Hints:
This is part of a larger assembly, with chains A (about 190 residues), B (about 625 residues), C (about 450 residues), D (about 170 residues) and E (about 200 residues).
Chain B: H1 2-17, H2 19-37, E1 45-47, H3 58-66, H4 68-87, H5 94-99, E2 104-106, E3 129-139, E4 148-151, E5 160-163, E6 205-209, E7 223-227, E8 241-251, E9 266-275, H6 292-296, H7 299-303, H8 307-314, H9 323-333, E10 352-357, H10 363-373, H11 387-391, H12 410-413, E11 417-421, H13 428-440, E12 442-443, E13 454-455, E14 459-464, H14 477-480, E15 493-497, H15 503-518, H16 550-563, H17 570-584, H18 597-613, H19 620-635
Parallel strand pairs in B: 1-2, 10-14, 10-15, 11-14
Antiparallel strand pairs in B: 3-6, 3-8, 4-5, 6-7, 8-9, 12-13
Helix pairs in contact in B: 1-4, 3-4, 8-9, 17-18, 17-19, 18-19
Chain C: H1 2-17, H2 26-36, E1 41-45, H3 46-52, H4 54-62, H5 64-83, E2 96-100, E3 119-129, E4 133-142, E5 149-152, E6 178-179, E7 185-196, E8 209-214, E9 227-237, E10 246-256, H6 271-283, H7 286-294, H8 303-314, H9 343-353, E11 360-361, E12 372-377, E13 380-387, H10 389-393, E14 400-401, H11 408-420, E15 422-424, E16 433-435
Parallel strand pairs in C: 1-2, 8-10, 11-14
Antiparallel strand pairs in C: 3-7, 3-9, 4-5, 4-6, 4-7, 7-8, 9-10, 12-13, 15-16
Helix pairs in contact in C: 1-5, 3-4, 7-8
Chain E: H1 2-22, H2 34-60, H3 68-106, H4 117-134, E1 155-156, E2 158-159, E3 164-165, E4 174-175, E5 182-183, H5 185-194, E6 197-198
Antiparallel strand pairs in E: 1-5, 2-6, 3-4
Helix pairs in contact in E: 1-2, 1-3, 2-3, 3-4
One magnesium ion binds near residues 344, 401 and 402 of chain C.
The structure holds a DNA duplex (8 and 15 nucleotides).
Keywords (chain D): DNA replication, Nucleus
Protein name (chain D): DNA replication complex GINS protein PSF3
Subcellular location (chain D): Nucleus
Amino acid sequence: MSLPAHLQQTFSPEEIQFIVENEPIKIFPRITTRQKIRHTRWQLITTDDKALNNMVAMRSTEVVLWIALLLKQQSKCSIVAPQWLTTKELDRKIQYEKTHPDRFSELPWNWLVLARILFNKAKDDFHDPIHELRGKIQDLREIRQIKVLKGLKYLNESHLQLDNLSLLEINELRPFITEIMDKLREIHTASLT
Amino acid sequence: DAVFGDRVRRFQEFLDTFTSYRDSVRSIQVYNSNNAANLNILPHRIIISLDDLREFDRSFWSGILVEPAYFIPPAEKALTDLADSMDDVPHPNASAVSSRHPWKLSFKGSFGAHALSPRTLTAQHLNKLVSVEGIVTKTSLVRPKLIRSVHYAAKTGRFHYRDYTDATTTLTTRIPTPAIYPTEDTEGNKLTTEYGYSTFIDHQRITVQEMPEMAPAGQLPRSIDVILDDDLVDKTKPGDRVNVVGVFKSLGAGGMNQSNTLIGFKTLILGNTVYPLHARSTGVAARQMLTDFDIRNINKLSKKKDIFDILSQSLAPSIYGHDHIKKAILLMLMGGVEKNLENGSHLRGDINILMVGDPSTAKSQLLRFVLNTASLAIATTGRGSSGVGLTAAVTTDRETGERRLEAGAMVLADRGVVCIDEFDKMTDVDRVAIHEVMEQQTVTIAKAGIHTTLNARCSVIAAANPVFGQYDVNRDPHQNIALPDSLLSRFDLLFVVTDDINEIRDRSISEHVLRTHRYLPPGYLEGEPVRERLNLSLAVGEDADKLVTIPFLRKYVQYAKERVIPQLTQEAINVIVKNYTDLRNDDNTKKSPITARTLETLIRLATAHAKVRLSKTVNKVDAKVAANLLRFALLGE
Amino acid sequence: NDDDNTEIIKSFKNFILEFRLDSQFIYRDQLRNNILVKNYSLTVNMEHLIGYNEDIYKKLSDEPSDIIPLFETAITQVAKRISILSRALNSLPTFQLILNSNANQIPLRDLDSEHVSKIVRLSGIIISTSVLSSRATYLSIMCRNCRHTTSITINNFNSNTVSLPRSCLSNCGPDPYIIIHESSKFIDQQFLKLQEIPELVPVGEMPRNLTMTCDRYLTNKVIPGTRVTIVGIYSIYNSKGVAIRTPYIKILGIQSDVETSSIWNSVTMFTEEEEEEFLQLSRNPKLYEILTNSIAPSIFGNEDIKKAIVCLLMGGSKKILPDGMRLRGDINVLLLGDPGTAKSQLLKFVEKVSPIAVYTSGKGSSAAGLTASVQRDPMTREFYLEGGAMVLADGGVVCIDEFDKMRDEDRVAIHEAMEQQTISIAKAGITTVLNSRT
Amino acid sequence: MGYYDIDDVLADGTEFPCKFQYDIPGLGYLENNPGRPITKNTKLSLPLWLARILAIVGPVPFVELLPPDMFSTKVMNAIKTDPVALDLHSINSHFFSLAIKWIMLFSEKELANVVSELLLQRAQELNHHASSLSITNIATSTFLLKLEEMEKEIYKKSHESYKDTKRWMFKK
Amino acid sequence: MYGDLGNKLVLEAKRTKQLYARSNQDVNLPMYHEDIIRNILKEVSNLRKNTEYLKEQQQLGMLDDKVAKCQYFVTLLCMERNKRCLLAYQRLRTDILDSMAWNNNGLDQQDTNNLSHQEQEYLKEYCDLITDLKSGDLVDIDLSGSLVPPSDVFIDVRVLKDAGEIQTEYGVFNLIKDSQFFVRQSDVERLIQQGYLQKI
DNA sequence: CACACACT
DNA sequence: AGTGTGTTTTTTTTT
Ligand SMILES: Nc1ncnc2c1ncn2[C@@H]1O[C@H](COP(=O)(O)OP(=O)(O)OP(O)(O)=S)[C@@H](O)[C@H]1O
Ligand SMILES: Nc1ncnc2c1ncn2[C@@H]1O[C@H](COP(=O)(O)OP(=O)(O)O)[C@@H](O)[C@H]1O
Ligand SMILES: [Mg+2]
Ligand SMILES: [Mg+2]
Ligand SMILES: [Zn+2]
């Protein structure tokens, strides 16, 4: 058909992955795209290739995520971990979440997808041991789910608010939440004259 | 007791919330007082539904379920003090005042979350009040329990009351004590035990089993015992579907005394209140309700002559034809008057009909229809039951410890319509036993050490196949059936069913079956599997509480047995005797000399026909109709 | 060592929390599952345990009897850590462990006097199942005169049972702590009996049977007459013959040797896919003849006979009329003909096809109570109702042999039962009626 | 609600008890007896899609509906006792839709309140069940049986999203 | 009772849509249930006949519109219910048609027996319209382009079935049975559409 | 659980 | 004076 029903209801995890790929990211080159004053330019409409024309091996460079992953598949790219990804930041966020059962922590919504992709490919470049990072992010996911559950006790027909919930979790939750919410709205409207 | 007192206060707030309850208690007390002035004193039993009080206090209603052993005790204490502060008639029966009359709490409706079934009952839900409806095979006899001991030495002027609630009635699990009645009391005082003023509660160990059909295939019914102590004593007979509201409790220390140590734990359901519902498909416990609207109904039709035929048509609507047979079974259903005489000779008003039919003549279903139509409905086949077992089993029971009377069908038979199928196959010893005990309607049961005679008066329908596959007219009827005329004459009606087949009638049967088959059951999806579910009946206890509808018809006819008591009327008497003139000495050899039995049979038949008319006495129309139907049956037409 | 035991508990929780494959911690997955549906039970594979840490597995093997309660406590603490907010007895029921071994199975026969209190792997067919028996997870007591009330949490991991408390324990007596059976928390147990490996067929040896016990998330999983591959510790307790005690098994995991799924509660293990191709076969009329031909291999024809067999096995629909009546669904097919014509062979094949009922023979079946026999129980002199063949056949399409050879009189009692689709018994003063859907 | 919705039509088709406040000739075919006309004060189940209009049409409505056992007081009692326990599908495969139509016809807040409460409780339980993922459970299937078909659809979609996620992050 | 026939029809249609929906993969369109359709056709004709009898009914003696016109309006209700049931069934059919067109003719029940003529040319012209959308503008993108986000252009693929050489844009490629081939994503996708490739 | 014996 | 220990034929069912 024009569009499968499941697709129009919610964004697929692969679509989330694509969106995250559209994000920029800090990396290190292993190629000096700069040409000595003493070829072929990338010429991208979606992203300024001037930076892409300007990489030098092992220098500060920011690029969009998907090209970074593409080049990281090759030996020519080195990825930079985010600051929140650092184990100390993870521990602080865990402590915050334990401290504040009411609400969530200001995580970068795409953090789940970022963690997935980096674990898939950037396993090498993690300064911190990767397995502990996996465990910590798993625990954060669990805690966020539990905090959701208490929110489910407080589902309302009027207003639902989510301050710091990640894009992945809100996407996977949207179908059921919207169904329940709109059903409550319809019930109330029928109650009203 | 601070939490206990708080729960007492909350229960008082409940009583304040629902006046009707205190009003019912008020009506109970005045009922107690006037009857005391006059019997039948209802106990201090008070019934409050789970759906009741659920509204004003979610917390209290929940905690009743979660911790009944902590909620009901204070609730009943508050109930009692409210009643005694509100009965306002303390002086009469001052002797029983000291003995004290506990006020009891009951419930209505289905817990659902708590009330599921005996089989579904597991230890995971224990010490919480639940309800299950089940069949009870075992009932223990009553034994009073002396919880409040009255004992007193004349010199003291004290009248000590040492009250002991060891295991059963207690909910706090008070320590066991023997109640020795020390002959020194405290100050060397004789301490005479004063009989009376002492509480006694007749204990019952009653074990309840699940449905055979609800039990999955290959699974024996699950059984659990319940306790009844001079509060709920003996509404129900063994083998009856009954809903009990009980708490899941454990005793015997789980058997973990000192070491074997893997033995199971002793648990049991103690039931505060019980709702007996033994009616088929969860009806009205075979107790048809009555309203003045329903009372005035039907009657106007009873004036019309066709009402009898309408009732006949209503019976076995799934069967085609057999209109005279349906009239006969209708006459069966209505019960005749048991004429009594100032001697051992008591005339029987029971209706007994024997029928012989080809296989698959629907008579089996007919017997089944009589079953599901009758209240008691004691039915089986010739091979279905052991004759001695159904009549009386004089074997001992190990728990009882001595010789026991066990009448499988007989004691169940009396005071209710009963059925028997394939009596030709029935054990001949059972046949000779039923002979003359169904004539005299009483069994001496003098067999073995027990000699007590128990009455067995009931209405019985017999459906035995011919000795040959089908009745052959060339063969004699007694050649066609080997059952001797002994007590075969003692059948108020005799019937022969022959599956002869005619194009018109064959088409009629076929069309009837076609209508019955393609018909989707009431409601449901057309492409929906059969459900025959439990019906999830929330209503429990007082919550449960020209064509004519069938259960409505049954209620009407039961009301008739309750009310219509016709007496043999003189013009009907003359019609009867005028028939009998030639009936006993009929020139036509209809076989089975009618003798004196058939006169009484026709008497009963005319009486029940008058009962159809609802007349307070018999009429000659009843007599002539009965005679016409009898000659119809005897000619075989 | 109690601190050391707590350290071992911590090591086990480190196992479960940090054992993953492909970033997937299956243990927390099943944990959250058992949180969503509140089954306080956990399944673990010892191969995984060895892979993560041999030492913990070895400590397990040394004396599982007391290692298991520590593991249960660890799982309970883990559940408290995960599924309960931080700083937010009997508040959370303890989770119980489930294990799959995949090691060798010593036969029930030839079990040694050794292996006492040792985890073992076996297989056998159930001959009997016990009713549920609660077990005091938590015990509530009070010191009688001293009035001191205390808590006890006894595990079913010793031997037999723990004796009742003695002395005041902060004279109050040799057992002041009278158990108040209200706060005390119980879990049901069920006893099992396995026949020794019907395939083993020890020639001339009567099949030995051992007793078992099951926990609340193990009980009632399987029925008698069904073979199960069991993984439970070898267990010994005193029945009440010197220094000889009852041998039994405390089960840590249950697996079906017959491998047949449990009572089908309409949960589609075939799922939408397999039933979709099932309907496609129903959609294609040729598949009807496919089923026809497939039945009775090597029969060489008789195809309409096989069609009739398929239709009978297919089950006639029982319609319940709004009237007290009810259309009879099942039918019973009659097999008359010359001997040596694979008739009994075909019956056996059909019964093998559909085990909802049981193949029998007339002489082999007891003449009295073919539908349901009445037997005197050893501990109750009353003759109880034992389920006969058509009790088992109820809910199943049943094949029985030698109808002609059978005595006719009781076969008369069969036609009525099948006609009514129930089995009505009032013999011996017992008026039980059981359904016969066969 | 969707006009082309299948459940819309199905719920509309269900017959409901209607008492005839009018005795109008010619409508006997509605009782499959076209020759016999309609008589006054007669109760009769009639399809909901007909029924709600027939209640609407009338001054005094020509035909009056009856309080369904579908909406009997014991129904609400069972709901309030335990929303989870009740097998809604056994009560109806379209109970929620029928309640919606009734409330649009009759704005009873208390019925709306209890319906909302039941829906909420089944919503938490459905979230629990959908979040549970195989790597099936009998209790989940039993719950599925206890649910209305539309509830089953919500569970299907939610569990489908869960499965998509779990297959996504846990494997390439 | 009249819509009851339509009720069975719509129950059948809901069964079909459940059957298709539960399987993410394509479900061959079930046989067109023209039996029930024609039954409803006669019912509506006879329904129209009874409406005419109501008009003639009045012209003669049923002049009590309160009664007669009420009866006619009721008939109208019945016929509208039947019509709406048929519309829902037909719309569901057409949704399946569009789905199958996109999945087979756009991505590349082949038999039309399950399908009636009218809807046969309906689906044919719908496919033509889809091509027209592909035609002219928007030709750059595939109107039936894969809705999955593209993971990696270069992937190795083993040949599912041997079909000889098939020309790509620039590289020769022989479909030798079970041969790995690591190339751009367009060609491998289009051959997956024919299924000649596999395993990703 | 709890009360007569046989020494404790 | 320690402390321990004991009491609740029949009838089917084969055959
Ligand atoms: N038509 C046939 N096709 C294949 N094998 C057949 C056929 N007829 C007979 N047999 C074989 O002959 C054997 C004899 O049948 P049995 O299984 O012993 O039972 P049965 O045919 O009921 O014999 P009776 O009547 O009990 S002595 C079958 O097991 C088949 O192996
Ligand atoms: N007149 C009839 N109308 C409808 N069904 C009939 C009739 N006669 C026999 N049957 C059918 O015959 C079947 C067997 O009847 P059953 O009660 O076993 O016969 P019998 O009278 O020999 O005991 C049933 O399905 C019953 O409905
Ligand atoms: Mg019969
Ligand atoms: Mg044979
Ligand atoms: Zn003490």
